[PDB]
Design an enzyme around this catalytic site. Structure first.
Site, PDB file in Angstrom:
ATOM      1  N   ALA B  60       0.920  -0.926   0.078  1.00 51.20           N
ATOM      2  CA  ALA B  60       0.098   0.075   0.044  1.00 51.20           C
ATOM      3  C   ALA B  60       0.864   1.281  -0.008  1.00 51.20           C
ATOM      4  CB  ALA B  60      -0.966  -0.104   1.205  1.00 51.20           C
ATOM      5  N   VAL B 139      -3.813  -4.287  -3.261  1.00 49.36           N
ATOM      6  CA  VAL B 139      -4.644  -3.742  -2.207  1.00 49.36           C
ATOM      7  C   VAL B 139      -6.026  -3.219  -2.801  1.00 49.36           C
ATOM      8  CG1 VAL B 139      -3.582  -1.394  -2.290  1.00 49.36           C
ATOM      9  CG2 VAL B 139      -4.599  -2.324  -0.054  1.00 49.36           C
ATOM     10  N   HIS B 160      -5.794 -14.786 -15.305  1.00 48.40           N
ATOM     11  CA  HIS B 160      -6.177 -13.484 -15.803  1.00 48.40           C
ATOM     12  C   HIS B 160      -7.499 -13.212 -16.523  1.00 48.40           C
ATOM     13  CE1 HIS B 160      -5.816  -9.462 -17.262  1.00 48.40           C
ATOM     14  NE2 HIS B 160      -4.636  -9.274 -17.118  1.00 48.40           N
ATOM     15  N   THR B 172      -0.187 -11.658 -23.736  1.00 51.34           N
ATOM     16  CA  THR B 172       0.679 -10.758 -23.484  1.00 51.34           C
ATOM     17  C   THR B 172       1.904 -11.142 -23.061  1.00 51.34           C
ATOM     18  OG1 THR B 172      -0.432  -9.555 -21.883  1.00 51.34           O
ATOM     19  CG2 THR B 172      -1.023  -8.957 -23.968  1.00 51.34           C
ATOM     20  N   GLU B 230       4.755  -9.550 -13.879  1.00 55.61           N
ATOM     21  CA  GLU B 230       3.936 -10.406 -14.327  1.00 55.61           C
ATOM     22  C   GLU B 230       4.544 -11.034 -15.442  1.00 55.61           C
ATOM     23  OE1 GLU B 230      -0.536  -9.578 -14.482  1.00 55.61           O
ATOM     24  OE2 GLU B 230      -0.060  -9.417 -16.699  1.00 55.61           O
TER      25      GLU B 230
END
Lengths: 272, 272
Positions: B60, B139, B160, B172, B230
């Site tokens: 955060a 978050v 995803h 991707t 990712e």
């Protein structure tokens, strides 16, 4: 731990189930192994990279030594081919064990005897050092198709071919409350056959040690479970859920049950 | 290790699949977790008997501290309820962390910072002692339905929501051969999102350590992977297959994607 190499295969599509006709996962999220659920090439890589050794334990006593030649010869054709395999043949007639020619990386030990005890007690230390997984089957069988590393997991059972379509009230569990193997009528996931189970050495020693102790308790109380060691196996697998379940493709009898359409392969079958 | 108690529930029927509309097992025999595939009561017992502690790690930073109140309050309602949970909130503003009331057996640590590095490097020893499993999420999300112990396994990824119906050519992935994250067009099982992954502490330290080192290599060669961490996560999970895959029930955006019929629950979703 170690990384897979580049491989080419068909993309698994989330919106196209391969099998729509059968249950392929248990409620506790263990795979039920049916043809079409696995890619053997991916699995062979994973297990080869780990240098996996599989022990197969088989009991050949009295007249049953007659089944070893066909058992072992079909095993060489179909069982864990490409992997390291160690057969342990428990027999009362070591000299009647046929001379079978084995593929590379495969070996056979003949162990003389005078079952749950034998696997758990006597051969405790030995199995721990020599193999990663242990599989226990009956000798009066032959391999007809692929049985490989798709079966391997910490603990597995096999669906009894007579009971896979039945309700739990029909299962031939021990129903007498005085037995350690007692299962009430409203309990039970599956009826597992005692002729094909296994897992990692540690989970098998645990299982056979538990069944042996429970059978001894039944003996002290002068009770013998209706299906003997199979009754206790079913009790253990009720309370300790297997991490894979094999479909009846892995244990069939064509003479008695034919060849229903749900079975795309008959892999391991009773001998006429 | 320890034995389950007597339980009453519906008999799993081998000839009645619960889901016929979706793939529920990967080709390497990992469950894909969809509503209707699991019995939460069986799973809650297994994990409670082991006294399981789950760590949830969340970042955060800057404006994103605004999302913590709703994040934590919905987590208290829906995330691992009944189990021991330890939240680790990594933030640059420790004093802006809202005071949220936690259920019994649940705790929160605020850790100040100046991501793959943070999980693998700094908090190496700490995570090893305090928790059995680690889950990393973003978050800016809220829990809307049950997220529990069905997700827990040595290593998991999440599908995803944009790509679950796509062909691998559309994914991707990093397509430049000069990146460590490079995946050729004919490789790939799934496109996994970086916003929800986890597993046992050991498998997560391994994963984040691998991605961190590969990102450093890309940095030395003046290349940054198209989708950053990712991209590297997808490369790792291609070569080290997850032992469970979560369906897009576990990661959705209703505003962008609606509510298709395949999703029987929306569990964890983007905040407007």
């Amino acid at each position: 731990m170690v990384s897979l190499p580049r491989m080419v295969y068909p993309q698994p599509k989330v919106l196209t189930p391969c099998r729509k006709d059968v249950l392929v996962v248990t409620p506790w999220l263990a795979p039920i192994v049916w043809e079409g659920t696995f890619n053997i090439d991916i699995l062979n890589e994973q297990f080869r990279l780990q240098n996996t050794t599989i022990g197969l334990t088989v009991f050949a006593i009295k007249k049953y030594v007659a089944f070893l030649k066909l058992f072992l010869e079909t095993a060489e054709k179909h069982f864990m081919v490409g992997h390291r395999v160690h057969y342990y043949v428990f027999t009362d007639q070591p000299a009647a064990v046929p001379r079978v020619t084995l593929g590379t990386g495969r070996q056979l030990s003949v162990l003389e005897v005078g079952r749950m005890e034998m696997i758990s007690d006597f051969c405790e230390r030995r199995f721990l050092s020599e193999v990663d997984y242990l599989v226990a089957v009956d000798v009066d069988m032959e391999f007809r198709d692929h049985v490989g590393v798709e079966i391997l997991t910490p603990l597995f059972g096999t669906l009894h071919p007579s009971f896979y379509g039945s309700s739990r009230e029909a299962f031939t569990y021990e129903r007498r409350p005085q037995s350690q193997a007692y299962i009430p009528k409203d309990e039970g996931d599956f009826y597992y056959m005692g002729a094909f189970f296994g897992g990692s050495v540690q989970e098998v020693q645990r299982l056979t040690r538990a069944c042996h102790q429970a059978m001894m308790v039944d003996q002290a109380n002068g009770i013998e479970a209706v299906w003997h060691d199979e009754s206790h196996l079913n009790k253990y697998l009720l309370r300790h859920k297997p991490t894979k379940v094999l479909s009846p493709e892995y244990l069939w009898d064509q003479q008695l049950l034919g060849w229903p359409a749900v079975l795309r392969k008959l892999r391991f079958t009773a001998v006429p």
